[PDB]
Amino acid sequence: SRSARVSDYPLANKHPEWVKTATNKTLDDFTLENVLSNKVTAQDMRITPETLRLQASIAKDAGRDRLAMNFERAAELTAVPDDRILEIYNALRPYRSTKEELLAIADDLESRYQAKICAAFVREAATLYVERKKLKGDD
Amino acid sequence: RSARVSDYPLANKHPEWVKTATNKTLDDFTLENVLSNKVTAQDMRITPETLRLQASIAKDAGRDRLAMNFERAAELTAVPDDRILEIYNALRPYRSTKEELLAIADDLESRYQAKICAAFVREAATLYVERKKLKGDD
Amino acid sequence: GFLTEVGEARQGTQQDEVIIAVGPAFGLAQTVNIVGIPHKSILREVIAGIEEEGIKARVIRCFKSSDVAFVAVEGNRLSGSGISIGIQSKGTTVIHQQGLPPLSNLELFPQAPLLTLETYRQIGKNAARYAKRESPQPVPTLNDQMARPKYQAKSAILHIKETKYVVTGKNPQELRVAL
Amino acid sequence: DGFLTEVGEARQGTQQDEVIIAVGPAFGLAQTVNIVGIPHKSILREVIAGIEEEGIKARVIRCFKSSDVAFVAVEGNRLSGSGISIGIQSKGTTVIHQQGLPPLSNLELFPQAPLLTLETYRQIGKNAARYAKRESPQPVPTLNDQMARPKYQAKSAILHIKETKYVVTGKNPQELRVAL
Amino acid sequence: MRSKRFEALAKRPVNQDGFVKEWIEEGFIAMESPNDPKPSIKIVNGAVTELDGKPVSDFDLIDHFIARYGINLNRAEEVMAMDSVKLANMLCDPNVKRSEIVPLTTAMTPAKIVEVVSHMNVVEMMMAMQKMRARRTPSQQAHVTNVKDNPVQIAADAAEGAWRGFDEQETTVAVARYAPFNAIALLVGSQVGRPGVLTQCSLEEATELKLGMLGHTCYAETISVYGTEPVFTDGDDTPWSKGFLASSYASRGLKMRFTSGSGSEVQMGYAEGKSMLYLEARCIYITKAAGVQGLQNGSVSCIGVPSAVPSGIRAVLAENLICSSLDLECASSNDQTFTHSDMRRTARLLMQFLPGTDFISSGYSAVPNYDNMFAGSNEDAEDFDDYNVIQRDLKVDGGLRPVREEDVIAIRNKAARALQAVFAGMGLPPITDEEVEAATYAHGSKDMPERNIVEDIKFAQEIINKNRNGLEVVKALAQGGFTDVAQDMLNIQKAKLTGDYLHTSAIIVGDGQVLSAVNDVNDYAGPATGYRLQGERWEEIKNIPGALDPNE
Amino acid sequence: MRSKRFEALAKRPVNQDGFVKEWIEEGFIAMESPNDPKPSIKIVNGAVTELDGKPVSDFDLIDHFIARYGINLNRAEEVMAMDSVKLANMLCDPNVKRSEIVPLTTAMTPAKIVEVVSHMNVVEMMMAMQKMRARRTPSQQAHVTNVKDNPVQIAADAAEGAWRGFDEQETTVAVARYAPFNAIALLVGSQVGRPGVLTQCSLEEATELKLGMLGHTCYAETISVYGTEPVFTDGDDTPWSKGFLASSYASRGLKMRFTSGSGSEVQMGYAEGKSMLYLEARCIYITKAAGVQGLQNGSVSCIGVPSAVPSGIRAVLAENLICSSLDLECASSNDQTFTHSDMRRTARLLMQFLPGTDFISSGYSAVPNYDNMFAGSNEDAEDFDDYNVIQRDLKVDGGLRPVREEDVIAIRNKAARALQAVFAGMGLPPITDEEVEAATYAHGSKDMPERNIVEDIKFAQEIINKNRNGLEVVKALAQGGFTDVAQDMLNIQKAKLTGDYLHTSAIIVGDGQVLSAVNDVNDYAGPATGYRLQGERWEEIKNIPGALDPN
Ligand code: B12
Ligand code: B12
Ligand SMILES: [Ca+2]
Ligand SMILES: [Ca+2]
């Protein structure tokens, strides 16, 4: 995809046009007028995976690899609905799931959302949760 | 021959290098000798020899100005307490005439062999005239 | 020894009850809270507040964790009303409710040193009222900026000691209250 | 207005039974109250009363050569018939001095002007008179307040800077007539 | 027969503090414990087989997370071979650039970096901190709360805090169900004090993420991580759940940092015989590994633990330095009470205040401490004048400024009125004009009229359960006579779309301008270089109340 | 109406302090004043023709003294040409040895070094201070006085002070005639607390030298110097009279340092429109020029002046830094009250306490401040526990230690009894057993029975006028049941014969062992180097009262 260097930061100042919303809205579309008439709603105000990946490139150029990794993961999660986000987060908390439920979550993230990085992240947790006893029934 | 930092502290490395004005040693000063007046305050006075050994040490430690101070002190060990107070007060603001200061210098030099201090005082005399700190200038 | 085990605690047999879940050392290795109030007196007041509301009180001891939130959770999942009260030996208390995240709650009392026997009775009352699906005025908030400076280290020590009585995989035991 | 009138250069006392009160160059002039608002007129009134109640004469002079309270006082003990003097700065700082003592030495000192009251000032007069009669009076009770500097040092410096403007090098003291 | 000298000393407030002798077995030792692991690392095929003496076969979830994501393996062996003393020297050496250090520090294992900073005294640590600090310009964060969760008071206090200079403000709750109200009141009031101030509401994790998704917060800070597996477990998370949570926040365009702090593992019962600093180091690496940009640390909420033992306050500064040395934004605590003594709390504060950090304090209390729902902060509303005076005394930028009573009254009043319009617009229990006046001139909740709490929490929960989002707040303001505040509110929401303030140490200043470590790079190189207090900012700091013209 | 928030703030103690806007014309500016002289130096035929912009034709006594004796002219031009920023960088750089800096600083003019340190923030200043400090080991000095000049109380308080760790103790007088009694009481009590502790009695110059000649003191500190000629003159000295006085003390084998401090010229009316730091720099150079080994500075008694203006506390740290950087022992103030606020006075103390100086405090009050005759110290007896706690918190050696009540009571009692024997043996107004008892358990003069002041000063003066020296004190102790204290007193007296403690930063520790910058060289080279708190000293600091074993 399109890369970015620290010189392209802040996007709002250097390349505001590069920023679009999940519904393809522009920063300028968000005005009191449009909000009041519901021409734009919460659904429109969502950061895109493109924006997060541009920031990831910038984080990388600033020498912050893990931060970039985090943004890449976030890019994939933009596609996952809020309720599903909360469900997966809670599934990862101690003693909440069986190994299979976690593996199923990984498959869902991958096949339904193309969230391959997060999918691998979850499968990694699944394996370690067995070893460190953090699966349901281990307490 | 001359003291170096390696010789410091004198009290620990060369106690014998230390003698008093009356040629007494550190060991002569005991409670017994104090109570019987075998030794008196007159006996307890640092010597110009000791101060010059310290001046040499100070110099070896990179502190020249401190060494000079000790050099002046060495000369002053010969001047009586009351005279020290006299000369000090004479150097304070508006206390003396230029003549009196030079008179003090000559005395320091001829009577005590304190040429450094004498020169110090003569220097003060000249500057006191210029900066008006002699008697009658206030 | 005013607390006797009567077997593994199980799902309530009636709706109108509130479970009081205590730490693994409550009334045992430790018998008073952080400021010296007797566990016997505390349990007495909490129960009294609950019964005052026409609700039954059922006491259980938890072993899987010493954390007051998780002790309280073991209780809300067994409580006939879904409402439970968690209490650590040092006195920290929380009113929990089945369905809420473990670290969330209905009411919390984060500064044990400030609780008095009156507060404990009030906590029992509110729990019972929640059990009755009512919306009671929360117990007035107690907050003292010097509570931590004076008691945090002690709290840690008391908790370290109660924590030695934690037993992995051991289900709660229902308890009979003496006298 | 001015309660102090110059009557000519202050000279050596003509009698032994007197205490000279030497005040700063701005006392009763550019400055009329001390650091805590006590009138200079009242201060002088009380110091004089304290001296006179001891059967000793009070003679007031103004010093110009320096605003330093010690030297203001020395200026006076040099002319006092008893050798005793009291130095007072406009801000209130006071010292009881004695001819023969080093300039920065003294008999009694009051280093914290903010703490002095008209009662202290009167007692300072009485003690000075007693020193004049060669007696050894119980020194005025020591007043010390750790917050005196924190609260008043800056003001003291400012007040002193202002009085110092009236210093005149080489100008001998002027005896003053005190108006009731 | 008692000594009156000791009877005087016995009454001193410091003697009410809690102190204890070191207890290694239970982790009651701040740092430099003989129980801590020797630094080490073995790498095979690009993967860690040993971490600080522990074989990969014995790794707990924390070792795994750090071994796989928290260390710069390319240079791990290289820096491990370097002398720790020389390394500590480099940290405080004004002539060894931060850019030259980061590559090496991020390659150190947790034990290694702890060994390094343990060779330093507090002065050297501060000297190093001013250099390692990510953002060039230091900042400040405040707590805005009250024992009643009174929304009107929160809005007013938040406005004053923002006006005094805080760039981040945080609230929390006495009664959890009140959260939505506290958060909204915090946000509205903050934007009124200074548009751009970021706000957060610290709650249980899932609850906070949900509140964030609804758009009632600008960021999240108290996203906890712990030094030992058992403690992390009672904390109801694992490194992976928190890692996933971190990315979830970013996926919604919300800035976030983790929180940790020396002593938490002791406070929670399982220190596994390790020193507080070593366990905190693990937390800092968990944060790095997760890809989180910053961390709130320096004992934080458990300050009573390290402070009770020797070199505890020194350890606190050390953990802060480790955080910044690992190229992470550092919100350096100084937000929790640990002593009854003003002398003692001042010494603890200056450790970060003097050198400056991303956020000198991560919770200065903008309300009197009796209202501080975090159980009291190291500094509170009554210390504002002392804080400004010390800034002036030492010519140190502490992030705050002197303010006029008239301006604060006006700002507090506008904040309360703005919230009144929000409640009216959203159909919430009314805020009366009497409450507006009370909030305007109040010092604390003792000056506020009692509200119907049962009714407030009922509607507060309807906000969550019916998913009433932030745009309803914008509309209420816009239709209630506050078009300006509404626009500022909308602007803060738009910041969540660009991803700009997601970067290291990011805050928003001036006209919605992001200021982070990316565009405000710290370039310290000794005297007369790097950030220097001067110009208008210095003039602003000089002008304190009571500074009267001497000249006259 | 009024904001309750602001009414709460208005009541705060800090708002009782004195603050003023800068007023350059009258010197009311701490440092970095646009009216300060640009650094410069011109040399012709080995003699200075210009010093910091001033032609030799306009030199005052201070310029002459500094130009002729306070600057190494061999490298002055070389150093003048060096970049000040770079020099400031070298000061805090842990890798630029102290030995490499001294040769440069001692060649700088007063304005030059001020320009250098002014480029630094307080953290850099502290970083540099820990390195420039002459003595490797930091120390502490305390005040021991009371509003009644009660000798029995002074003895007891002095014993306690010495026991707590102070290596130097100082007293002064409410009534000047009491001096001899205060000094003797301080000396006896101090030696009982810990033999080797050095004592001084601050008075008018001639009076103090005389008292020193009689042997009732171990050293002198308040040997004042000032930054402007008019002020120096009202101070009753010149650079030459003070230079002469310095050597006079040495000629008698007595240790001495000068005293100065930012703001004095303002307090005394003639700042000649210069910043406080610049004027203080002149004082520091006068001290160096005179050959004096150390200096007590950091505003000291006029702390209310710099503290009133911006960056005043920073300037105080700066002047301490200049002192140490010039290779002079530095007794860094923290001995005078300037604020009503505990937070503010703590921030002021930490500037020297954190890095450590030869004497962190040149007058920590070992008595409650109401009894402090220097008008109150930045710290007093009631802060002892806080001080020990902060040492423990930061692992910083503040020179003091925790102590047991039983040990202090015993030590104070012995000091009072020892002084009682001195007075009885010297035919001085009696110290009763009731007084010994009162001094033992007292906190301050409020717990002491009134004495006959007229009687005491009468006899105190006979000591001076009849020239009764220190041996009479030794004799009295040796014949009154205190052979041990007598031996210690004699040993302290014998220290004036060797000249060893006349050296930079010298104190006497352990068993008559001199510890100075000569045999305790500060070798700082960054982390893990130089002085480090540890071992038994660390254990002693860790053991504060109230620290129970968590079992
Ligand atoms: C110190 C502290 C912490 C420490 C220590 C907790 C521990 N379990 O050991 C740490 C940092 C780990 C912590 C964590 C959390 N805390 Co907390 N914490 C505090 C604080 C500032 C002080 C309490 C104190 O020292 N009291 C004095 C001592 C002597 O009394 P004590 O009875 O022994 O105190 C204990 C309780 O307070 C308890 N505790 C602390 N937090 C929480 C949270 C919950 C839900 C429960 C049941 C218990 C509990 O731990 C203390 C020590 O054992 C309070 C503020 C306040 N108003 O009290 C918040 C506070 C109680 N915590 C809060 C929250 C939300 C949390 C977290 C859920 C946050 C998160 N990111 O997950 C976690 C829960 C951890 C857990 N498993 O218990 C909220 C509660 C809101 C509510 N009404 O429900 C408060 C009011 C404010 C805040 N946000 O910090 N906390
Ligand atoms: C600040 C201070 C100083 C400052 C300011 C003096 C000035 N002239 O501006 C400096 C450092 C310069 C100083 C110098 C000296 N001081 Co002084 N000083 C103090 C101190 C700590 C506080 C006074 C104060 O701030 N009061 C609060 C303000 C608001 O009140 P104020 O009335 O305006 O205060 C003024 C007087 O105190 C006066 N002052 C200060 N010292 C002296 C000394 C003498 C002899 C006189 C007449 C006046 C005087 O200066 C103040 C400002 O104008 C007092 C301690 C105490 N117990 O008060 C000692 C004290 C008064 N000083 C003392 C002495 C001995 C001296 C010196 C002689 C020392 C020396 N090395 O020569 C010199 C005298 C200089 C001079 N020509 O006046 C002794 C007096 C003993 C006695 N009973 O006679 C005291 C008690 C203790 C001490 N050793 O420091 N001092
Ligand atoms: Ca915070
Ligand atoms: Ca002193």
Side-chain angles (χ1 to χ4, degrees), chain F residues 403-417:
Chain F
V403 293
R404 303 188 307 169
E405 188 180 324
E406 62 192 298
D407 294 334
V408 172
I409 286 173
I411 196 72
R412 291 176 67 90
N413 181 272
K414 182 173 180 185
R417 284 186 287 107

PDB file of all heavy atoms in Angstrom, chain F residues 403-417:
ATOM      1  N   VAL F 403      18.366   8.419  65.675  1.00  0.00           N
ATOM      2  CA  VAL F 403      18.990   8.274  66.982  1.00  0.00           C
ATOM      3  C   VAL F 403      17.980   7.801  68.005  1.00  0.00           C
ATOM      4  O   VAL F 403      16.784   8.047  67.862  1.00  0.00           O
ATOM      5  CB  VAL F 403      19.572   9.614  67.474  1.00  0.00           C
ATOM      6  CG1 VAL F 403      20.734  10.040  66.594  1.00  0.00           C
ATOM      7  CG2 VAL F 403      18.482  10.680  67.464  1.00  0.00           C
ATOM      8  N   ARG F 404      18.463   7.129  69.044  1.00  0.00           N
ATOM      9  CA  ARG F 404      17.573   6.639  70.091  1.00  0.00           C
ATOM     10  C   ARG F 404      17.379   7.709  71.160  1.00  0.00           C
ATOM     11  O   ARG F 404      18.318   8.419  71.519  1.00  0.00           O
ATOM     12  CB  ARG F 404      18.141   5.374  70.724  1.00  0.00           C
ATOM     13  CG  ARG F 404      18.398   4.248  69.743  1.00  0.00           C
ATOM     14  CD  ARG F 404      18.763   2.979  70.490  1.00  0.00           C
ATOM     15  NE  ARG F 404      19.863   3.210  71.422  1.00  0.00           N
ATOM     16  CZ  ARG F 404      20.256   2.340  72.345  1.00  0.00           C
ATOM     17  NH1 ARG F 404      19.635   1.173  72.461  1.00  0.00           N
ATOM     18  NH2 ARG F 404      21.265   2.636  73.154  1.00  0.00           N
ATOM     19  N   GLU F 405      16.157   7.821  71.664  1.00  0.00           N
ATOM     20  CA  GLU F 405      15.857   8.808  72.688  1.00  0.00           C
ATOM     21  C   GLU F 405      16.749   8.610  73.912  1.00  0.00           C
ATOM     22  O   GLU F 405      17.259   9.573  74.482  1.00  0.00           O
ATOM     23  CB  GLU F 405      14.394   8.708  73.112  1.00  0.00           C
ATOM     24  CG  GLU F 405      13.964   9.830  74.029  1.00  0.00           C
ATOM     25  CD  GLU F 405      12.517   9.725  74.449  1.00  0.00           C
ATOM     26  OE1 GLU F 405      11.688   9.294  73.619  1.00  0.00           O
ATOM     27  OE2 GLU F 405      12.205  10.087  75.605  1.00  0.00           O
ATOM     28  N   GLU F 406      16.928   7.356  74.309  1.00  0.00           N
ATOM     29  CA  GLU F 406      17.741   7.032  75.475  1.00  0.00           C
ATOM     30  C   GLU F 406      19.185   7.500  75.332  1.00  0.00           C
ATOM     31  O   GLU F 406      19.791   7.947  76.305  1.00  0.00           O
ATOM     32  CB  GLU F 406      17.707   5.526  75.731  1.00  0.00           C
ATOM     33  CG  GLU F 406      18.281   4.705  74.593  1.00  0.00           C
ATOM     34  CD  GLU F 406      17.987   3.226  74.736  1.00  0.00           C
ATOM     35  OE1 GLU F 406      18.442   2.622  75.736  1.00  0.00           O
ATOM     36  OE2 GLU F 406      17.298   2.671  73.847  1.00  0.00           O
ATOM     37  N   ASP F 407      19.738   7.403  74.126  1.00  0.00           N
ATOM     38  CA  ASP F 407      21.115   7.829  73.905  1.00  0.00           C
ATOM     39  C   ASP F 407      21.235   9.345  73.962  1.00  0.00           C
ATOM     40  O   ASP F 407      22.210   9.879  74.493  1.00  0.00           O
ATOM     41  CB  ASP F 407      21.631   7.349  72.547  1.00  0.00           C
ATOM     42  CG  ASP F 407      21.746   5.837  72.459  1.00  0.00           C
ATOM     43  OD1 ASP F 407      21.916   5.191  73.515  1.00  0.00           O
ATOM     44  OD2 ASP F 407      21.685   5.299  71.331  1.00  0.00           O
ATOM     45  N   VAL F 408      20.246  10.032  73.401  1.00  0.00           N
ATOM     46  CA  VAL F 408      20.241  11.485  73.376  1.00  0.00           C
ATOM     47  C   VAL F 408      20.090  12.060  74.784  1.00  0.00           C
ATOM     48  O   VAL F 408      20.789  12.997  75.154  1.00  0.00           O
ATOM     49  CB  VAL F 408      19.113  12.006  72.458  1.00  0.00           C
ATOM     50  CG1 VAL F 408      18.989  13.511  72.576  1.00  0.00           C
ATOM     51  CG2 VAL F 408      19.417  11.625  71.015  1.00  0.00           C
ATOM     52  N   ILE F 409      19.180  11.494  75.567  1.00  0.00           N
ATOM     53  CA  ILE F 409      18.971  11.953  76.930  1.00  0.00           C
ATOM     54  C   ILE F 409      20.276  11.810  77.708  1.00  0.00           C
ATOM     55  O   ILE F 409      20.703  12.732  78.403  1.00  0.00           O
ATOM     56  CB  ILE F 409      17.862  11.134  77.627  1.00  0.00           C
ATOM     57  CG1 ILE F 409      16.497  11.553  77.076  1.00  0.00           C
ATOM     58  CG2 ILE F 409      17.924  11.327  79.136  1.00  0.00           C
ATOM     59  CD1 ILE F 409      15.340  10.705  77.574  1.00  0.00           C
ATOM     60  N   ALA F 410      20.917  10.655  77.570  1.00  0.00           N
ATOM     61  CA  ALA F 410      22.166  10.399  78.265  1.00  0.00           C
ATOM     62  C   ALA F 410      23.266  11.355  77.829  1.00  0.00           C
ATOM     63  O   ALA F 410      24.011  11.867  78.663  1.00  0.00           O
ATOM     64  CB  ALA F 410      22.608   8.959  78.033  1.00  0.00           C
ATOM     65  N   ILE F 411      23.365  11.603  76.525  1.00  0.00           N
ATOM     66  CA  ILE F 411      24.400  12.491  75.996  1.00  0.00           C
ATOM     67  C   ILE F 411      24.183  13.952  76.412  1.00  0.00           C
ATOM     68  O   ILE F 411      25.143  14.656  76.736  1.00  0.00           O
ATOM     69  CB  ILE F 411      24.479  12.387  74.444  1.00  0.00           C
ATOM     70  CG1 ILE F 411      25.781  12.998  73.945  1.00  0.00           C
ATOM     71  CG2 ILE F 411      23.298  13.090  73.797  1.00  0.00           C
ATOM     72  CD1 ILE F 411      26.998  12.157  74.270  1.00  0.00           C
ATOM     73  N   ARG F 412      22.928  14.401  76.399  1.00  0.00           N
ATOM     74  CA  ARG F 412      22.589  15.775  76.790  1.00  0.00           C
ATOM     75  C   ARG F 412      22.878  15.970  78.280  1.00  0.00           C
ATOM     76  O   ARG F 412      23.427  16.998  78.696  1.00  0.00           O
ATOM     77  CB  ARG F 412      21.107  16.065  76.532  1.00  0.00           C
ATOM     78  CG  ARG F 412      20.707  16.148  75.067  1.00  0.00           C
ATOM     79  CD  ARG F 412      19.202  16.346  74.928  1.00  0.00           C
ATOM     80  NE  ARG F 412      18.766  17.646  75.429  1.00  0.00           N
ATOM     81  CZ  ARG F 412      18.693  18.748  74.690  1.00  0.00           C
ATOM     82  NH1 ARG F 412      19.023  18.711  73.406  1.00  0.00           N
ATOM     83  NH2 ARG F 412      18.296  19.892  75.233  1.00  0.00           N
ATOM     84  N   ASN F 413      22.498  14.973  79.078  1.00  0.00           N
ATOM     85  CA  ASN F 413      22.712  15.008  80.517  1.00  0.00           C
ATOM     86  C   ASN F 413      24.197  15.105  80.832  1.00  0.00           C
ATOM     87  O   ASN F 413      24.602  15.891  81.686  1.00  0.00           O
ATOM     88  CB  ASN F 413      22.119  13.756  81.170  1.00  0.00           C
ATOM     89  CG  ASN F 413      22.299  13.743  82.679  1.00  0.00           C
ATOM     90  OD1 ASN F 413      23.314  13.266  83.194  1.00  0.00           O
ATOM     91  ND2 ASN F 413      21.321  14.286  83.396  1.00  0.00           N
ATOM     92  N   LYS F 414      25.010  14.319  80.136  1.00  0.00           N
ATOM     93  CA  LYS F 414      26.446  14.354  80.369  1.00  0.00           C
ATOM     94  C   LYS F 414      27.046  15.707  79.982  1.00  0.00           C
ATOM     95  O   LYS F 414      27.972  16.193  80.637  1.00  0.00           O
ATOM     96  CB  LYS F 414      27.154  13.244  79.593  1.00  0.00           C
ATOM     97  CG  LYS F 414      28.651  13.213  79.851  1.00  0.00           C
ATOM     98  CD  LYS F 414      29.325  12.015  79.206  1.00  0.00           C
ATOM     99  CE  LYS F 414      30.821  12.027  79.481  1.00  0.00           C
ATOM    100  NZ  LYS F 414      31.532  10.930  78.766  1.00  0.00           N
ATOM    101  N   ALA F 415      26.523  16.313  78.920  1.00  0.00           N
ATOM    102  CA  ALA F 415      27.021  17.605  78.466  1.00  0.00           C
ATOM    103  C   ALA F 415      26.690  18.678  79.495  1.00  0.00           C
ATOM    104  O   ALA F 415      27.523  19.524  79.810  1.00  0.00           O
ATOM    105  CB  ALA F 415      26.410  17.960  77.115  1.00  0.00           C
ATOM    106  N   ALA F 416      25.466  18.638  80.013  1.00  0.00           N
ATOM    107  CA  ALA F 416      25.028  19.602  81.017  1.00  0.00           C
ATOM    108  C   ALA F 416      25.862  19.457  82.292  1.00  0.00           C
ATOM    109  O   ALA F 416      26.276  20.454  82.883  1.00  0.00           O
ATOM    110  CB  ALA F 416      23.553  19.399  81.332  1.00  0.00           C
ATOM    111  N   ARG F 417      26.100  18.215  82.714  1.00  0.00           N
ATOM    112  CA  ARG F 417      26.892  17.956  83.916  1.00  0.00           C
ATOM    113  C   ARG F 417      28.334  18.393  83.707  1.00  0.00           C
ATOM    114  O   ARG F 417      28.975  18.917  84.621  1.00  0.00           O
ATOM    115  CB  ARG F 417      26.852  16.468  84.282  1.00  0.00           C
ATOM    116  CG  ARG F 417      25.544  16.028  84.925  1.00  0.00           C
ATOM    117  CD  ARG F 417      25.592  14.578  85.399  1.00  0.00           C
ATOM    118  NE  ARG F 417      25.548  13.611  84.300  1.00  0.00           N
ATOM    119  CZ  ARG F 417      26.581  12.879  83.890  1.00  0.00           C
ATOM    120  NH1 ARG F 417      27.767  12.993  84.481  1.00  0.00           N
ATOM    121  NH2 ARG F 417      26.427  12.019  82.890  1.00  0.00           N
TER     122      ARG F 417
END
